[PDB]
Amino acid sequence: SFVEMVDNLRGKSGQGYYVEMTVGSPPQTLNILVDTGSSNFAVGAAPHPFLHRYYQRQLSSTYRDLRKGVYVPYTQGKWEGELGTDLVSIPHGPNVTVRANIAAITESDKFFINGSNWEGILGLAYAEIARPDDSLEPFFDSLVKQTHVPNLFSLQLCGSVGGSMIIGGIDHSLYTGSLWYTPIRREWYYEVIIVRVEINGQDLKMDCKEYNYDKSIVDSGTTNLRLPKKVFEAAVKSIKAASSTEKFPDGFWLGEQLVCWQAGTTPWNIFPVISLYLMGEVTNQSFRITILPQQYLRPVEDVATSQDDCYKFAISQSSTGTVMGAVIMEGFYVVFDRARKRIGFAVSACHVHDEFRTAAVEGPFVTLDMEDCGYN
Ligand SMILES: COC[C@@H](Oc1cc(C[C@@H]2C[S@@](=O)C[C@H](NCc3cccc(C(C)(C)C)c3)[C@H]2O)cc(F)c1N)C(F)(F)F
């Protein structure tokens, strides 16, 4: 019955993907950002310049105050509010209702995005990183505990944008080829291990621990591919060399300045493909996902009145490990198989197009000593 969940996601470029939910009795409708990088379910519950609607606890007969405060500091953005529980449903999701923890957001700073069209966030990761602490049961744990929904979900994020969140299973009509699985290293973030990196077929040749320093996570709430300082520098250097045929302001490589070309003349060919190899399911085995420039050059509306094609560099430097954000996930079907502690990747039905190249998930590869790639 997964067909009812196909295309249940919407979004705007650089502004996340959201699903429709209802909270309270009678049901109040809200759009909720889908975030595999956090574990709190939180909604605007007070007026805000960027909110067109919000959760009104006073109007819900099933609302229960937990009489505890809470705050969450993200990389960028934070909010604080009051904890409580209430009934929650997903109209274009499984046909169930659950009582879940909800953080009612009363104050925030750089959390809500002007024009994003979402009013809350659904953290889909594990209790370990929930605030105030791991005793606050995350939404998906409540869903699985209270219903017969199987303990997994999958995300098809498509390149204003749409996608699918299949709750409780895998919809085989949403991908082509085979699914390749990498272990979830530890259940807090969706942490994985990258074992090799190549750019246009050239190995970066770093200690693979550098790729996962201090962790690597799959995070739908983050837009960019984010890379640890040393890896970022090596990657940009290689990407610059490959595209040196053209000139870019260095504010572009910092993800600040956008670059434009005459509509339809974007020189895709001069930008390399990036291959990330992930730890596999059997001994000394891995697989790779290959990312095209159409993924890491994010389309942005022209600052000028011109109808050029403009882009921002969507790879940026991190001090908290690798983050495989939305631009990596786009064009792949990603299965969060919590039941079997693994994450699967397959080429998405809405895969990214290139004239002479194609995003891919390929294996098996042999890779020795993969355990040594994890950072401790
Ligand atoms: C520019 O934003 C676009 C972004 O909007 C937001 C998205 C988030 C979710 C964040 C995005 S970034 O902060 C990484 C983080 N995941 C890893 C992480 C890093 C630090 C702390 C935590 C804990 C929550 C576990 C404590 C988790 C993730 O959840 C928070 C926000 F405010 C905004 N606006 C959009 F629109 F989704 F693309």
From Swiss-Prot:
E.C. designation(s): 3.4.23.46
UniProt entry tagged with the keyword Cell wall biogenesis/degradation: no
Catalytic reaction annotation: Broad endopeptidase specificity. Cleaves Glu-Val-Asn-Leu-|-Asp-Ala-Glu-Phe in the Swedish variant of Alzheimer's amyloid precursor protein
Activity regulation (UniProt): Inhibited by RTN3 and RTN4.
Example of a GO cellular component annotation carried by this entry: endosome
Positions annotated as active site in the UniProt record: 35, 219
Domain notes: DXXLL motif is required for a proper endocytosis and retrograde transport to the trans-Golgi network, as well as for regulation of lysosomal degradation. The transmembrane domain is necessary for its activity. It determines its late Golgi localization and access to its substrate, APP.
Family per similarity comment: Belongs to the peptidase A1 family.
General function of this protein: Responsible for the proteolytic processing of the amyloid precursor protein (APP). Cleaves at the N-terminus of the A-beta peptide sequence, between residues 671 and 672 of APP, leads to the generation and extracellular release of beta-cleaved soluble APP, and a corresponding cell-associated C-terminal fragment which is later released by gamma-secretase. Cleaves CHL1.
UniProt name for this protein: Beta-secretase 1
The organism of origin for this protein: Homo sapiens
Stretch of the intact protein here: 59 to 446 of 501
